[PDB]
């Protein structure tokens, strides 16, 4: 994460999208509290629960947790970064969101 | 990284999900693709010692679970398959097929 | 990375009055927009836009017209957000320009009417206009060498503190007739060429000839 | 929007050596600061600052001096945050310039002393200096047409692979006396005018006359 932060904006320097956005509205929550608790991004420097590997059943969008990041020696502007998506034998990746825009347009 | 993409954007992906074991009434075992059925997903989560509780398949009546899965596999006739244009990204694999189960979970 | 200063070579076409050029490698930060190098004498810094980002390509900043002395540079990298990097300071003994300019308006005083390739007086008067770079380097002189009709050297005279020269009758009629042809005569057809030189500064870019 | 290339017209005052100009509409994004169009031959891209934002006004980028051939452009819009838009690529068969420069230093060799409007030799020698755009377009020639004292055309001669021409005595004394006045004579008073032309490139901006 620290190595990757060098090649990012000042914001989103140490951040990651929440794996699960909506979790379920029951009698344990109220409307205001339930819809205020839902978060979009979490800081990785103080959230050890954001480094757990999720498990996905069906087609769902999940963020990638970096586990390696390093550049080439004679080409320092070429950087290899490894993101661990999901757990177990998955069928495959349907699409990749490079930023907020998927490679395959809508 | 070059003159144009000066920063590494946040990477997210749309996975298809972990493959699950779908038990059939006759006795054969089919685990080649992920399943949207809730009972099979719960059975995968409950019989995995890597993530979750390690409940062996011995402590499970296969016939009852198979019969209860078909309850969630009942075809719904309220809507038409043509009405979903994002068929590939809602868990379906072939628009020609039925894909109209009463309860489908991603 | 690798902030250095490279003095200009001895003699090259063009590059008149150019001191050494400053070179550096691009910052490893990839969102830098430009660099602000601050010369000591100049009130405003040079702004060098980074338009093409190749880490293994040297960026340059040339100096033209700065007199020799103590020059202190400070190089910074500027982001898109406006944050500046820690400056890189280089103090180098700046050299004197070694690619001077050609003497201008090298014309012959006392010239014949109608046709200009003909003399009118016994002594040819050589007038030239000042070289522009006199201001930058004070210790500069002019080497005026006069040739013959048969492409044989005759005179090599240095002119200093004056932008004009005359070729006395006595000289041609006695000294350069005797020492060369061992006799009395006056070479009627001559060729004059002149250039600028300094004690430490080097020659002009090219010869200035009639 | 609407990235196009418009070749320059045939003949217009000024615009010497100018190829076609590139035009585009401003990006609908309102926080774009400038545009970075990258020509194939040039190492650095053109930076066009967007200072006035009117969506229905075309921005321009002219090309001066690029030789005809295969030119590929890529146009991007740059934000304040540094994000670049998806490039717009246009490959157009770039034309040859059609607004050439005037011939320079069109002077008469063998000219009379004292007064320059008088001949000195039997054959007038016409010397001209090279047009600057020779390098860009190789297939260029000069159309030298000579007129009379009474504003009557005499000669129309094309000069190629040479920057000089002579007007032989035989020509004037026989050919152009006989074919025009049906007799023997030599038009003493003449008018010479010349311009540059190419097989595909068009005429010079204006006539170069004595």
Coordinates of C-alpha atoms in Angstrom, one line a residue:
Chain A
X1 CA 0.0 0.0 0.0
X2 CA 2.8 2.5 0.9
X3 CA 4.6 1.8 -2.4
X4 CA 1.4 2.1 -4.4
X5 CA 0.5 5.4 -2.7
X6 CA 3.4 7.1 -4.5
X7 CA 1.5 6.7 -7.8
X8 CA -1.9 8.0 -6.6
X9 CA -3.7 11.3 -6.1
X10 CA -3.3 13.1 -2.7
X11 CA -6.9 11.9 -2.0
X12 CA -7.5 8.1 -2.3
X13 CA -3.9 7.8 -1.2
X14 CA -4.8 5.1 1.4
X15 CA -8.4 4.2 0.6
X16 CA -10.4 1.2 -0.6
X17 CA -14.0 0.8 -1.5
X18 CA -16.2 -1.1 1.0
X19 CA -16.7 -4.7 -0.2
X20 CA -20.4 -4.8 0.8
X21 CA -22.4 -1.6 0.3
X22 CA -25.9 -2.7 1.4
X23 CA -26.2 -5.4 4.0
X24 CA -29.9 -5.6 5.1
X25 CA -32.5 -3.5 6.8
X26 CA -34.2 -5.2 9.7
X27 CA -35.8 -4.3 13.0
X28 CA -32.2 -3.8 14.5
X29 CA -31.8 -0.6 12.5
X30 CA -33.8 2.5 11.7
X31 CA -34.1 4.2 8.3
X32 CA -31.8 7.2 9.1
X33 CA -29.2 5.1 11.0
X34 CA -29.3 2.3 8.4
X35 CA -28.8 4.6 5.4
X36 CA -26.2 6.7 7.3
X37 CA -24.1 3.7 8.2
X38 CA -23.5 2.6 4.6
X39 CA -20.0 3.7 3.6
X40 CA -18.3 3.9 0.2
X41 CA -14.6 3.9 1.0
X42 CA -12.4 2.9 4.0
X43 CA -8.9 4.0 5.0
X44 CA -6.4 1.1 4.9
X45 CA -4.0 2.6 7.4
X46 CA -6.3 2.0 10.4
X47 CA -8.9 -0.6 9.2
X48 CA -7.6 -4.1 9.6
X49 CA -11.0 -5.5 8.6
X50 CA -10.6 -4.1 5.1
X51 CA -7.7 -6.6 4.4
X52 CA -9.9 -9.7 4.7
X53 CA -10.6 -11.7 1.5
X54 CA -14.3 -11.8 0.6
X55 CA -16.2 -14.7 -1.0
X56 CA -18.6 -14.0 -3.9
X57 CA -21.4 -16.1 -5.2
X58 CA -22.8 -14.9 -8.6
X59 CA -21.9 -11.8 -10.5
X60 CA -20.9 -9.0 -8.1
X61 CA -18.6 -6.0 -8.1
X62 CA -15.7 -6.1 -5.5
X63 CA -12.6 -4.0 -4.9
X64 CA -9.1 -5.4 -5.2
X65 CA -6.8 -5.5 -2.2
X66 CA -3.1 -4.9 -3.2
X67 CA -0.6 -7.5 -2.2
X68 CA 2.4 -6.5 -4.3
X69 CA 3.6 -3.4 -6.1
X70 CA 6.9 -2.7 -7.7
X71 CA 8.4 -1.0 -10.8
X72 CA 10.8 -2.2 -13.5
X73 CA 14.5 -1.4 -13.1
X74 CA 15.4 0.3 -16.3
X75 CA 11.8 1.4 -17.0
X76 CA 10.7 2.9 -13.6
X77 CA 7.4 4.3 -15.0
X78 CA 6.2 0.7 -15.7
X79 CA 4.7 -0.5 -12.4
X80 CA 3.4 -4.0 -11.6
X81 CA 0.7 -4.1 -8.9
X82 CA -1.1 -7.3 -7.8
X83 CA -4.7 -7.1 -6.6
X84 CA -6.4 -10.1 -4.9
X85 CA -10.0 -10.4 -5.9
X86 CA -12.4 -12.7 -4.1
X87 CA -11.7 -16.2 -2.6
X88 CA -11.8 -19.8 -3.9
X89 CA -12.1 -21.1 -7.4
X90 CA -14.1 -18.4 -9.2
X91 CA -15.6 -18.8 -12.7
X92 CA -13.7 -15.7 -13.9
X93 CA -13.6 -12.0 -14.2
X94 CA -16.4 -10.4 -16.2
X95 CA -15.1 -6.9 -16.4
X96 CA -12.5 -4.6 -14.9
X97 CA -13.1 -1.0 -13.8
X98 CA -9.8 0.7 -14.4
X99 CA -11.1 3.9 -12.7
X100 CA -14.8 4.4 -12.5
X101 CA -15.3 3.4 -16.2
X102 CA -15.4 -0.3 -17.1
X103 CA -13.3 -1.5 -20.0
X104 CA -16.4 -2.8 -21.8
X105 CA -18.7 0.2 -22.1
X106 CA -22.3 0.1 -21.1
Chain B
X1 CA 2.4 5.5 -16.5
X2 CA 3.1 8.2 -19.1
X3 CA 2.2 11.8 -20.1
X4 CA -1.6 11.0 -19.9
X5 CA -2.3 8.4 -17.2
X6 CA -0.2 10.1 -14.5
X7 CA -1.9 8.3 -11.6
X8 CA -2.9 4.8 -10.9
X9 CA -6.8 4.7 -10.7
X10 CA -8.8 2.7 -8.2
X11 CA -9.2 -0.8 -9.6
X12 CA -12.4 -2.8 -9.2
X13 CA -13.7 -5.9 -11.0
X14 CA -16.9 -7.8 -11.6
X15 CA -16.2 -11.5 -10.7
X16 CA -18.6 -14.3 -11.5
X17 CA -18.1 -16.0 -8.1
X18 CA -16.9 -19.2 -6.5
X19 CA -18.0 -22.5 -8.0
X20 CA -20.4 -24.5 -5.7
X21 CA -21.4 -28.1 -5.6
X22 CA -25.0 -28.7 -6.8
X23 CA -26.4 -32.0 -5.6
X24 CA -28.8 -33.9 -7.8
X25 CA -31.5 -36.3 -6.7
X26 CA -30.1 -39.3 -8.6
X27 CA -26.7 -39.0 -6.9
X28 CA -24.3 -37.3 -9.4
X29 CA -22.4 -34.2 -8.2
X30 CA -22.1 -31.1 -10.4
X31 CA -19.6 -28.4 -9.4
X32 CA -18.4 -26.6 -12.6
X33 CA -20.2 -23.2 -12.3
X34 CA -21.4 -20.9 -9.6
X35 CA -25.1 -21.1 -8.6
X36 CA -27.6 -18.4 -7.8
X37 CA -29.6 -20.7 -5.6
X38 CA -29.5 -19.5 -2.0
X39 CA -29.4 -23.0 -0.5
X40 CA -26.4 -24.1 -2.5
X41 CA -24.5 -21.0 -1.5
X42 CA -25.3 -21.5 2.1
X43 CA -24.3 -25.1 1.9
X44 CA -21.0 -24.1 0.4
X45 CA -20.4 -21.5 3.1
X46 CA -21.3 -24.0 5.9
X47 CA -19.2 -27.0 4.7
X48 CA -16.0 -25.0 4.1
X49 CA -13.2 -25.3 6.7
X50 CA -11.1 -22.6 4.9
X51 CA -13.7 -19.8 5.5
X52 CA -16.7 -20.3 7.8
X53 CA -17.7 -23.3 9.9
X54 CA -16.5 -26.9 9.2
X55 CA -19.8 -28.8 9.1
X56 CA -19.2 -32.1 7.3
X57 CA -21.5 -33.3 4.6
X58 CA -22.3 -36.2 6.9
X59 CA -24.4 -33.9 9.1
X60 CA -26.8 -33.1 6.3
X61 CA -29.9 -34.9 4.8
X62 CA -29.2 -34.6 1.1
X63 CA -32.7 -35.5 0.0
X64 CA -34.4 -32.7 2.1
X65 CA -31.9 -30.1 0.9
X66 CA -32.4 -31.1 -2.7
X67 CA -36.2 -31.0 -2.3
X68 CA -36.0 -27.5 -0.7
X69 CA -33.7 -26.2 -3.4
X70 CA -36.4 -26.8 -6.0
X71 CA -38.7 -24.6 -4.0
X72 CA -36.3 -21.7 -4.7
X73 CA -35.9 -23.0 -8.2
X74 CA -39.6 -22.5 -9.1
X75 CA -40.0 -20.6 -12.3
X76 CA -41.7 -17.2 -11.9
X77 CA -44.1 -16.2 -14.7
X78 CA -44.8 -12.6 -13.6
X79 CA -42.2 -11.0 -15.9
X80 CA -40.6 -11.8 -19.2
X81 CA -37.0 -12.7 -19.9
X82 CA -36.8 -10.1 -22.6
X83 CA -37.4 -7.3 -20.1
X84 CA -33.8 -7.6 -18.6
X85 CA -31.2 -6.2 -21.0
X86 CA -28.3 -6.6 -18.6
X87 CA -28.9 -10.4 -18.6
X88 CA -25.2 -11.3 -18.5
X89 CA -24.4 -9.2 -15.4
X90 CA -27.3 -10.4 -13.2
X91 CA -26.0 -14.0 -13.0
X92 CA -27.7 -15.4 -16.1
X93 CA -25.6 -17.2 -18.7
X94 CA -27.9 -17.7 -21.7
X95 CA -30.9 -15.4 -22.5
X96 CA -32.5 -18.2 -24.5
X97 CA -32.8 -20.4 -21.3
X98 CA -35.5 -19.8 -18.7
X99 CA -33.4 -18.0 -15.9
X100 CA -36.7 -17.1 -14.2
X101 CA -36.2 -18.7 -10.8
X102 CA -38.4 -17.3 -8.0
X103 CA -35.4 -16.3 -5.8
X104 CA -32.0 -15.5 -7.3
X105 CA -29.1 -14.2 -5.2
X106 CA -25.8 -12.7 -6.2
Chain C
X1 CA 17.9 13.4 -10.4
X2 CA 21.5 14.1 -11.6
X3 CA 21.4 17.9 -11.7
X4 CA 24.6 18.8 -13.6
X5 CA 26.0 21.7 -15.7
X6 CA 27.8 21.1 -19.0
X7 CA 30.0 23.8 -20.5
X8 CA 29.6 24.4 -24.2
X9 CA 32.3 23.1 -26.5
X10 CA 35.0 25.1 -28.2
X11 CA 33.7 25.8 -31.7
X12 CA 30.3 24.9 -33.2
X13 CA 28.0 26.4 -35.9
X14 CA 25.4 28.7 -34.3
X15 CA 25.3 28.8 -30.5
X16 CA 26.6 32.4 -30.5
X17 CA 27.0 33.7 -27.0
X18 CA 25.7 30.5 -25.4
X19 CA 27.2 29.5 -22.0
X20 CA 26.9 25.9 -20.8
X21 CA 23.5 24.2 -20.6
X22 CA 22.0 22.7 -17.4
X23 CA 20.8 19.1 -17.5
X24 CA 18.7 17.0 -15.1
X25 CA 16.7 13.8 -15.1
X26 CA 12.9 14.0 -14.6
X27 CA 11.5 13.6 -11.1
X28 CA 10.3 10.1 -10.3
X29 CA 7.0 11.7 -9.3
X30 CA 4.7 11.3 -12.3
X31 CA 2.3 14.2 -11.8
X32 CA 5.0 17.0 -12.1
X33 CA 3.9 19.6 -14.6
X34 CA 7.0 21.9 -14.9
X35 CA 10.3 22.8 -13.2
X36 CA 11.2 26.1 -11.8
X37 CA 15.0 26.7 -11.8
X38 CA 16.0 29.9 -10.2
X39 CA 19.2 31.6 -11.5
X40 CA 21.0 33.9 -9.0
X41 CA 21.3 36.9 -11.2
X42 CA 17.9 36.7 -12.9
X43 CA 14.9 38.0 -10.9
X44 CA 12.6 35.5 -12.5
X45 CA 13.2 31.7 -12.6
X46 CA 13.2 29.7 -15.8
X47 CA 10.0 27.6 -16.2
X48 CA 10.6 24.4 -18.1
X49 CA 7.4 22.6 -19.0
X50 CA 7.5 18.8 -18.7
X51 CA 5.4 17.8 -21.8
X52 CA 6.8 14.3 -22.5
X53 CA 7.6 12.0 -19.6
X54 CA 10.4 9.5 -20.2
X55 CA 12.4 8.8 -17.0
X56 CA 15.6 8.0 -18.9
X57 CA 15.7 11.2 -21.0
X58 CA 17.6 14.3 -19.9
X59 CA 15.9 17.6 -19.8
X60 CA 17.9 20.7 -20.6
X61 CA 18.0 24.4 -19.8
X62 CA 20.6 26.5 -21.8
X63 CA 22.2 29.8 -20.6
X64 CA 22.8 32.5 -23.2
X65 CA 24.5 35.8 -22.3
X66 CA 25.3 35.3 -18.7
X67 CA 28.8 36.6 -17.7
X68 CA 31.3 34.3 -16.1
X69 CA 31.3 34.3 -12.3
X70 CA 29.6 32.7 -9.4
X71 CA 26.2 31.4 -10.4
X72 CA 24.0 29.5 -8.0
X73 CA 21.0 27.5 -9.3
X74 CA 18.1 25.9 -7.5
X75 CA 15.9 23.3 -9.2
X76 CA 12.5 22.4 -8.1
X77 CA 9.7 20.1 -9.4
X78 CA 6.1 21.5 -9.3
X79 CA 3.1 19.3 -9.1
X80 CA -0.5 19.8 -10.4
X81 CA -1.6 20.5 -6.8
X82 CA 1.0 23.3 -6.5
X83 CA 3.3 21.4 -4.1
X84 CA 7.0 22.0 -4.6
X85 CA 9.8 19.5 -4.2
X86 CA 12.9 20.0 -2.1
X87 CA 15.3 22.2 -4.1
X88 CA 18.5 20.9 -5.7
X89 CA 21.2 23.5 -5.3
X90 CA 24.2 23.7 -7.7
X91 CA 26.9 26.4 -7.6
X92 CA 29.2 26.2 -10.6
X93 CA 31.9 28.6 -11.8
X94 CA 30.1 29.7 -14.9
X95 CA 32.4 29.9 -17.9
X96 CA 32.8 32.6 -20.5
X97 CA 31.0 32.1 -23.9
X98 CA 33.3 30.2 -26.4
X99 CA 31.2 30.7 -29.5
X100 CA 31.5 34.4 -30.2
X101 CA 29.6 36.3 -33.0
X102 CA 31.0 37.4 -36.3
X103 CA 32.4 40.9 -36.7
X104 CA 29.7 43.0 -38.4
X105 CA 30.0 45.7 -41.1
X106 CA 33.6 44.9 -42.0
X107 CA 34.0 47.7 -44.5
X108 CA 36.9 49.6 -46.1
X109 CA 37.1 53.3 -45.5
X110 CA 38.4 55.4 -48.3
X111 CA 36.7 53.4 -51.0
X112 CA 36.4 54.2 -54.7
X113 CA 33.2 55.7 -56.1
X114 CA 31.2 53.9 -58.7
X115 CA 32.9 50.5 -58.1
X116 CA 33.6 49.6 -54.4
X117 CA 36.3 46.9 -55.2
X118 CA 38.8 49.7 -55.9
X119 CA 40.9 51.8 -53.5
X120 CA 41.0 55.6 -53.6
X121 CA 43.7 56.5 -51.0
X122 CA 47.3 55.4 -50.5
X123 CA 46.5 53.8 -47.1
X124 CA 43.5 51.4 -46.9
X125 CA 41.5 52.2 -43.7
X126 CA 39.8 49.2 -42.1
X127 CA 36.6 50.0 -40.1
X128 CA 34.4 47.4 -38.3
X129 CA 31.5 47.7 -36.0
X130 CA 31.6 46.5 -32.4
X131 CA 30.9 42.8 -31.7
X132 CA 27.7 42.5 -29.6
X133 CA 29.3 40.5 -26.8
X134 CA 31.8 43.2 -25.7
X135 CA 29.6 43.8 -22.6
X136 CA 29.6 40.3 -21.3
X137 CA 33.4 39.7 -21.6
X138 CA 35.7 42.7 -21.2
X139 CA 39.0 41.0 -22.2
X140 CA 38.3 40.6 -25.9
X141 CA 40.5 41.6 -28.9
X142 CA 40.4 41.3 -32.7
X143 CA 42.9 39.3 -34.8
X144 CA 43.3 41.1 -38.1
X145 CA 45.4 39.1 -40.6
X146 CA 45.9 40.5 -44.2
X147 CA 46.6 38.2 -47.1
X148 CA 48.1 38.8 -50.6
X149 CA 46.9 38.4 -54.2
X150 CA 48.6 35.0 -54.5
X151 CA 47.1 33.6 -51.3
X152 CA 50.2 34.2 -49.1
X153 CA 50.0 35.5 -45.6
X154 CA 51.3 39.1 -45.2
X155 CA 50.3 40.5 -41.8
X156 CA 49.0 39.2 -38.4
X157 CA 48.2 42.2 -36.2
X158 CA 46.1 42.3 -33.0
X159 CA 43.8 45.3 -32.6
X160 CA 42.6 46.2 -29.0
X161 CA 40.7 49.2 -27.4
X162 CA 39.9 50.4 -31.0
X163 CA 37.3 49.3 -33.7
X164 CA 39.4 50.5 -36.7
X165 CA 42.8 50.0 -38.4
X166 CA 44.8 51.6 -41.2
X167 CA 47.4 49.9 -43.4
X168 CA 50.2 52.4 -43.8
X169 CA 52.1 52.9 -47.1
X170 CA 55.4 52.4 -45.4
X171 CA 54.4 49.0 -44.2
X172 CA 53.5 47.5 -47.6
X173 CA 56.1 49.4 -49.6
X174 CA 59.1 48.4 -47.5
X175 CA 58.6 45.8 -44.7
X176 CA 56.4 43.2 -46.4
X177 CA 57.9 43.7 -49.8
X178 CA 61.4 43.1 -48.5
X179 CA 60.9 40.3 -46.0
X180 CA 58.8 38.3 -48.5
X181 CA 60.1 39.1 -52.0
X182 CA 63.4 40.6 -50.8
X183 CA 62.9 43.8 -52.8
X184 CA 60.9 47.1 -53.0
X185 CA 57.2 47.0 -54.1
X186 CA 53.6 47.5 -53.0
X187 CA 51.1 44.5 -53.3
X188 CA 48.2 46.4 -54.9
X189 CA 45.7 43.5 -54.4
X190 CA 45.0 42.5 -50.9
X191 CA 42.6 40.4 -48.8
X192 CA 41.6 41.4 -45.2
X193 CA 40.0 39.1 -42.7
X194 CA 39.3 39.7 -39.0
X195 CA 37.7 37.8 -36.1
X196 CA 37.2 38.3 -32.3
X197 CA 39.2 36.5 -29.6
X198 CA 39.8 36.8 -25.8
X199 CA 42.4 35.8 -23.3
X200 CA 40.1 33.1 -22.0
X201 CA 37.2 33.3 -24.3
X202 CA 37.7 31.5 -27.6
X203 CA 37.5 32.5 -31.3
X204 CA 34.6 33.9 -33.2
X205 CA 32.2 31.5 -34.9
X206 CA 33.7 32.2 -38.3
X207 CA 36.0 34.5 -40.2
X208 CA 34.8 38.0 -41.3
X209 CA 36.4 38.7 -44.7
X210 CA 35.9 41.5 -47.2
Chain D
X1 CA -16.1 17.6 -31.2
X2 CA -15.8 17.7 -35.0
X3 CA -12.1 17.3 -35.4
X4 CA -11.3 18.3 -39.0
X5 CA -8.5 19.5 -41.2
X6 CA -9.1 22.3 -43.7
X7 CA -6.5 22.8 -46.5
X8 CA -5.4 26.4 -47.1
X9 CA -6.9 28.2 -50.2
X10 CA -5.1 28.9 -53.4
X11 CA -3.9 32.5 -53.2
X12 CA -4.2 34.8 -50.3
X13 CA -2.1 37.7 -48.9
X14 CA 0.3 36.6 -46.3
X15 CA 0.0 33.0 -45.1
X16 CA 3.4 32.1 -46.7
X17 CA 4.3 28.5 -46.4
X18 CA 1.2 27.7 -44.4
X19 CA -0.3 24.3 -44.8
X20 CA -3.9 23.6 -43.8
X21 CA -5.3 24.5 -40.3
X22 CA -6.8 22.1 -37.9
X23 CA -10.2 22.9 -36.4
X24 CA -12.2 21.4 -33.6
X25 CA -15.1 22.3 -31.3
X26 CA -14.5 22.8 -27.5
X27 CA -15.1 19.8 -25.2
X28 CA -18.4 19.8 -23.5
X29 CA -16.5 19.4 -20.2
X30 CA -16.3 23.0 -18.8
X31 CA -13.1 22.7 -16.7
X32 CA -10.7 21.9 -19.6
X33 CA -7.7 24.2 -19.5
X34 CA -5.9 23.4 -22.7
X35 CA -5.6 20.9 -25.6
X36 CA -2.5 18.8 -26.4
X37 CA -2.5 17.9 -30.1
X38 CA 0.4 15.6 -31.0
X39 CA 1.7 15.9 -34.6
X40 CA 3.5 12.8 -35.9
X41 CA 6.7 14.4 -37.1
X42 CA 7.1 16.9 -34.2
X43 CA 8.5 15.5 -31.0
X44 CA 6.5 18.0 -28.9
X45 CA 2.8 18.5 -29.1
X46 CA 1.1 21.8 -29.8
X47 CA -0.5 23.2 -26.6
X48 CA -3.6 25.3 -27.3
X49 CA -4.8 27.2 -24.3
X50 CA -8.6 27.4 -23.9
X51 CA -9.0 31.0 -22.6
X52 CA -12.6 31.8 -23.8
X53 CA -15.2 29.1 -23.6
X54 CA -18.0 29.4 -26.2
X55 CA -19.3 25.9 -27.1
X56 CA -20.3 27.0 -30.7
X57 CA -16.9 28.5 -31.6
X58 CA -14.3 26.6 -33.5
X59 CA -10.7 26.5 -32.1
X60 CA -7.9 26.4 -34.7
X61 CA -4.3 25.1 -34.9
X62 CA -2.4 26.1 -38.1
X63 CA 0.4 24.2 -39.7
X64 CA 3.3 26.1 -41.2
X65 CA 6.2 24.4 -42.9
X66 CA 5.3 20.8 -42.7
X67 CA 6.0 18.8 -45.9
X68 CA 3.3 16.9 -47.7
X69 CA 2.9 13.3 -46.7
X70 CA 1.2 11.1 -44.1
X71 CA 0.5 13.1 -41.0
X72 CA -1.3 11.6 -38.0
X73 CA -2.8 13.9 -35.3
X74 CA -4.1 13.0 -31.9
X75 CA -6.2 15.6 -30.0
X76 CA -6.8 15.5 -26.2
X77 CA -8.5 17.7 -23.7
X78 CA -6.7 18.4 -20.4
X79 CA -8.5 19.2 -17.2
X80 CA -7.4 21.3 -14.2
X81 CA -6.9 18.0 -12.3
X82 CA -4.5 16.7 -15.0
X83 CA -6.9 14.0 -16.3
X84 CA -6.7 13.6 -20.1
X85 CA -9.7 12.8 -22.4
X86 CA -9.7 9.9 -24.8
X87 CA -7.7 11.0 -27.9
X88 CA -9.3 11.9 -31.2
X89 CA -7.1 10.5 -34.1
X90 CA -7.1 12.0 -37.6
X91 CA -4.8 10.9 -40.4
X92 CA -5.0 13.2 -43.4
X93 CA -2.9 13.4 -46.5
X94 CA -1.3 16.7 -45.7
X95 CA -1.1 19.0 -48.7
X96 CA 1.8 21.1 -50.1
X97 CA 1.9 24.8 -49.3
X98 CA -0.1 26.8 -51.9
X99 CA 1.0 30.3 -50.7
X100 CA 4.8 30.4 -51.5
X101 CA 7.2 33.3 -50.7
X102 CA 8.3 36.0 -53.1
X103 CA 11.7 35.6 -54.8
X104 CA 14.3 37.6 -52.9
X105 CA 17.1 39.8 -54.2
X106 CA 16.0 39.8 -57.8
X107 CA 19.0 41.8 -59.1
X108 CA 20.5 42.3 -62.5
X109 CA 24.1 41.2 -62.9
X110 CA 26.3 43.3 -65.2
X111 CA 24.8 46.6 -64.0
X112 CA 26.0 50.1 -64.8
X113 CA 28.1 52.1 -62.2
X114 CA 26.8 55.3 -60.8
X115 CA 23.2 54.7 -61.9
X116 CA 21.8 51.2 -61.5
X117 CA 18.9 51.5 -64.0
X118 CA 21.4 51.2 -66.9
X119 CA 22.9 48.1 -68.5
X120 CA 26.7 47.7 -69.0
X121 CA 27.0 44.4 -71.0
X122 CA 25.3 43.2 -74.3
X123 CA 23.5 40.4 -72.4
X124 CA 21.6 41.2 -69.2
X125 CA 22.3 38.6 -66.5
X126 CA 19.4 37.9 -64.2
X127 CA 20.4 36.6 -60.7
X128 CA 18.0 35.8 -57.9
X129 CA 18.4 34.2 -54.5
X130 CA 16.8 30.9 -53.5
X131 CA 13.2 30.9 -52.3
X132 CA 13.2 29.7 -48.6
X133 CA 10.6 26.9 -49.2
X134 CA 12.9 24.9 -51.6
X135 CA 13.5 22.4 -48.8
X136 CA 9.9 21.6 -48.1
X137 CA 8.8 21.0 -51.7
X138 CA 11.5 19.7 -54.1
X139 CA 9.5 20.0 -57.4
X140 CA 9.5 23.8 -57.7
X141 CA 10.5 26.0 -60.6
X142 CA 10.6 29.7 -61.5
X143 CA 8.5 31.3 -64.3
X144 CA 10.5 34.2 -65.7
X145 CA 8.6 36.3 -68.1
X146 CA 10.2 39.4 -69.8
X147 CA 8.2 42.4 -70.9
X148 CA 8.8 45.3 -73.3
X149 CA 9.0 49.1 -73.1
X150 CA 5.4 49.3 -74.5
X151 CA 3.9 46.8 -72.0
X152 CA 3.9 43.9 -74.5
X153 CA 4.9 40.4 -73.5
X154 CA 8.2 39.2 -75.0
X155 CA 9.3 36.0 -73.3
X156 CA 7.9 33.3 -71.0
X157 CA 10.8 31.0 -70.0
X158 CA 10.8 28.5 -67.1
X159 CA 14.1 28.2 -65.1
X160 CA 14.8 25.0 -63.1
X161 CA 17.8 23.5 -61.2
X162 CA 19.5 27.0 -61.5
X163 CA 19.0 30.3 -59.6
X164 CA 20.2 32.6 -62.5
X165 CA 19.4 33.4 -66.2
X166 CA 21.0 35.4 -69.0
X167 CA 19.2 37.1 -71.9
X168 CA 21.3 36.4 -75.0
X169 CA 21.9 39.1 -77.7
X170 CA 20.8 36.6 -80.4
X171 CA 17.4 36.2 -78.8
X172 CA 16.4 39.9 -78.6
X173 CA 18.1 40.9 -81.9
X174 CA 16.5 38.2 -84.1
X175 CA 13.8 36.1 -82.6
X176 CA 11.7 38.6 -80.6
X177 CA 12.3 41.4 -83.1
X178 CA 11.1 39.3 -86.0
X179 CA 8.2 37.4 -84.5
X180 CA 6.7 40.6 -83.0
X181 CA 7.8 43.6 -85.2
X182 CA 8.6 41.4 -88.3
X183 CA 12.0 43.1 -88.6
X184 CA 15.6 43.3 -87.1
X185 CA 16.1 45.3 -83.8
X186 CA 17.0 45.1 -80.1
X187 CA 14.4 46.3 -77.5
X188 CA 16.7 48.4 -75.3
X189 CA 14.3 48.9 -72.5
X190 CA 13.0 45.8 -70.8
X191 CA 11.0 44.6 -67.8
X192 CA 11.8 41.4 -66.0
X193 CA 9.5 39.7 -63.5
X194 CA 9.7 36.2 -61.9
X195 CA 7.9 34.0 -59.4
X196 CA 8.0 30.5 -58.0
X197 CA 5.7 27.6 -59.0
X198 CA 5.5 23.8 -58.6
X199 CA 4.0 20.9 -60.4
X200 CA 1.4 20.5 -57.6
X201 CA 2.3 23.5 -55.4
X202 CA 0.8 26.7 -56.6
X203 CA 2.2 30.2 -57.5
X204 CA 4.1 32.6 -55.3
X205 CA 2.2 35.1 -53.2
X206 CA 3.1 37.9 -55.6
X207 CA 5.2 38.9 -58.6
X208 CA 8.9 39.8 -58.1
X209 CA 9.8 42.5 -60.5
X210 CA 12.8 44.7 -61.0

